Homo-oligomer: 254 residues x 4
């Protein structure tokens, strides 16, 4: 049919959103439009990475599930049993997206569960729901097309995390490479006095501890701030803020 129309739009979104970064919200919105049904891109753990509502049913049980952006733990592990595409599931199924729970009112309450694979592993679960039309081969082409693209974008987000988790640690260590012996001993006792990420630094409370100059403490802060690890601010008679997630971790290796 003129399914070609609904694919060009789905493609047109992807044909700019391609590259960085990954936006599951705007992506689920387009699926919601071209599949003409509710969309729930669900993580392995049951977390909602993105979603979009085409037809909204007024139910405190459901809209709440959407509020934590988390599905019930029992229902989450149930998706693992679904290995292949399971189309048009009934309101009396253990997989339905319609715990209404007066299901007589919901005769046309349908549910489609397409697993989201990145080849090597099941990365998530695409959940559909609709009250108007049956899920045909037409609606499955768009659902599976999307599920494949989601899988790539989940594997990308997970790849880019591992990349940056290591990159951030790398620049932290290079910043440490800059320090002298005293400057390191300085930095250690500095962030012990703070005991966290933010705080005010009493530079006179140190520099008497070991007899090392307060000017040494200045180098140690500039070198870190030079590599963007921190950023200090002149505050009365010094405020420092850590700009790196892994800085505190790598520092705690005495």
């Amino acid at each position: 049919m003129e399914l070609l129309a609904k694919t060009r739009k789905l493609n047109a979104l992807l044909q700019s959103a391609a590259g960085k970064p990954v936006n599951f919200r705007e992506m689920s919105d387009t699926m919601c439009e071209v599949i003409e049904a509710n969309v729930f891109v669900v993580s392995r753990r049951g977390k909602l990475l993105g979603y979009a509502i085409h037809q909204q049913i007024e139910n405190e049980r459901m809209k709440q599930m959407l509020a934590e952006r988390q599905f019930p733990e029992e229902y989450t592990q149930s998706l693992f049993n679904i290995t292949e595409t399971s189309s048009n599931l009934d309101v009396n199924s253990a997989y339905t997206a319609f715990p209404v729970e007066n299901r007589e009112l919901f005769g046309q309450g349908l549910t489609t569960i397409v697993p989201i694979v990145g080849g090597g592993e099941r990365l998530g679960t695409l959940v559909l729901a609709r009250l108007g039309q049956e899920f045909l081969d037409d609606d499955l082409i768009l659902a599976e097309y999307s599920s494949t693209v989601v899988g790539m974008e989940i594997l990308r987000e997970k790849a880019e995390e591992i990349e940056e988790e290591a990159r951030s640690k790398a620049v932290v260590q290079m910043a440490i490479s800059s320090l002298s012996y005293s400057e390191l001993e300085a930095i250690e006792h500095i962030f012990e006095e703070l005991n966290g990420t933010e705080g005010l630094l009493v530079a006179s409370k140190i520099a008497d501890r070991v007899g090392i100059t307060r000017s040494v403490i200045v180098n140690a802060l500039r070198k870190l701030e030079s590599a963007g690890v921190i950023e200090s601010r002149s505050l009365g008679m010094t405020y420092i803020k850590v700009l790196n997630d892994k800085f505190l971790q790598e520092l705690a290796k005495l």
Copy 2:
């Protein structure tokens, strides 16, 4: 009726290849199978990023340009004029994938040109060729859906190449931070004597013609070999080989 059957085949490859290739040969092979037509994924400058033949054509006019993995300059800048899916462009054209001398046999010979765009930038050009019948909405979906994925895969490669081209320089620079002054000036004169990637390191004069210790050259070479920059092999009278594309470039800064 199932276009779905032809989409599952295409989807099956895509997810089961998300694990980092990128392989345009594998992609082209499947398209050629599900689209049921010849596939030519063309780079911006005419290079074939990938291909797969469904129907063996008979001219060595094409069998040589295919053997060269490169399209003519004239035909390439012709592809820029195509801004959107052009379907079934005769054999009488300037866009046809069948440039022949004997055209009277290729009346049913056709061509379809789907552009490949991402981020806003025209990345490549998908080209289809078939003798059978005209490309239907059936094939146009599979063509456009493929051309969309090829787009975001080209963008992956360009971002991962930057990821690597810059990382490689970082490893080089990090190895240079290990050197002393004498250790550095040694490396400078070593690869001034080589005048290339590989060569034999005499150093019987090269070291003491300028007056550089033969032991400080070892430490300098061991440090470079530590970061995987180089790799030396032994002999009576040392052979060296640069394993980093960007090492020489970064070293050309005094």
Copy 3:
């Protein structure tokens, strides 16, 4: 007679001035040697000096930071040469090997009490000149690494933005209107925002706003735009 008192002092200055090197090391010798000090580079440059009596001859007077050179006998003076050149005298102790220490004084002529305070110092100087280079190549290369790390975090579009951003600034600092760059190539402004963050994350730049007037950006790395000028 106890030279220990004069060598305990000199030593108690180097333990404190351990690392972070010659402007203050020259003051060190000028005090304990009690003579003018001139720490001269292998090629003439003044790495540090300190004056004790200050002959106001002005055939010499140092903001040149470079002598009228060629001076070449520090060439030729391979050993400590005491009391060269009234008693306007000079002691020249070599540091060159693998710079040069020059002492000047009106009065005594170093005695034998001695250059052993100068030779002692002249050795420590050499170790700190060797420290200078090692702790320079360390930083000059590591900075280039941080920059390349920052660039590796960019996408193709995020890079295209950066290439244009600092092609507009025409220098180190300046105001940036993120408005128009998005219109010159047709890429999202959020891309420009994302690109600037990745640089600012590694401390390459700083980027804080000026309202709708624009965003002010200041490059904090000496090696950024250099490495950026490579295709």
Copy 4:
């Protein structure tokens, strides 16, 4: 005795480049003529050299606990401490300890003992600074290599060295593909990226598999998260 200042001059006027203060201990031991014992503040024998071998555990790396704490509160130069003479000179900006049964301890012997005690400090600080230099750089390269990976081969690398259970070992081809379900070409691309940064140095051995040897001290550790 200006040559006696020139002894200590060119003995470490090399100076330089790396830090080998075992070669420093004999420099003092030859010229102060002494048994030299460069001791860390906590107790480890950072270096030593013996001119006068005594018919007398140095084997090794630390001293008697409350002999070290005795040295700690020797805040000043104290020569001829008897018991076989003894001289203890502080090293701080470590501890230098001398001993002899010969020309006592001259105050010229003290000059060279005190002057050396200063140069030691500088080279302890230099060694310590250029060690933290290394230890951090040794981690930076590992993390650099790890950033090159993606989802699958991080998981591949995680399982590989988990099975290796140590530094070196043989990897049985595709026996590993069972336990992660990813293409096994992924494993190769993983091992290649690591050894491209000097983290490993592998070797293929035909139908047996592939041998691998970790070359980075900090790789095994940093990989342990997870």
